[PDB]
């Protein structure tokens, strides 16, 4: 049973930085089998992929959001963290941490196990 739990702050003013963190239980991120990605769902709009990290530290970011984004991983604590800066009314969304299977464990390029989601609100 693989579980993903988010604990980041959900109240961030504009021109600040997010500090979202997602811990994983039931699996070792240090195994390198999966990628670990952050996906945002704004209200009204559809899902948006922000980026992904791998145990070795390699990352792949959404080209539009690449400038102001950083995704890191701690294998010691079995978690990965998202930092989105230049926060603006566009950034208020439900943020999920999700396990991505890159064909290494069966399913090819499928986001299978999703986190509960944290509502990040942007206001002064």
């Amino acid at each position: 049973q693989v579980q993903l739990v988010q604990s980041g702050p959900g109240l961030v003013k504009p021109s600040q930085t997010l500090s979202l963190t997602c811990s994983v239980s039931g699996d070792s991120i240090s195994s390198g089998t999966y990628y670990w990605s952050w996906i945002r769902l704004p209200a009204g709009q559809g899902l948006e992929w922000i980026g992904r990290v791998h145990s070795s530290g390699s990352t792949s970011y959404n080209p539009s959001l690449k400038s102001r984004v950083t995704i890191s991983v701690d294998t010691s604590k079995n978690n990965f963290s998202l930092k989105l800066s230049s926060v603006t009314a566009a950034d208020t969304a439900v943020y999920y941490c999700v396990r991505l299977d890159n064909c290494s464990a069966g399913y090819c390029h499928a986001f299978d196990i999703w986190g509960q989601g944290t509502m990040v609100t942007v206001s002064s």
Binding site: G32, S56, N102, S104
Partner: peptide
């Protein structure tokens, strides 16, 4: 007649 396995990356 060769069976295809999974595509394992990063190893």
């Amino acid at each position: 007649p060769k069976k295809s396995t999974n595509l394992v990356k990063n190893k």
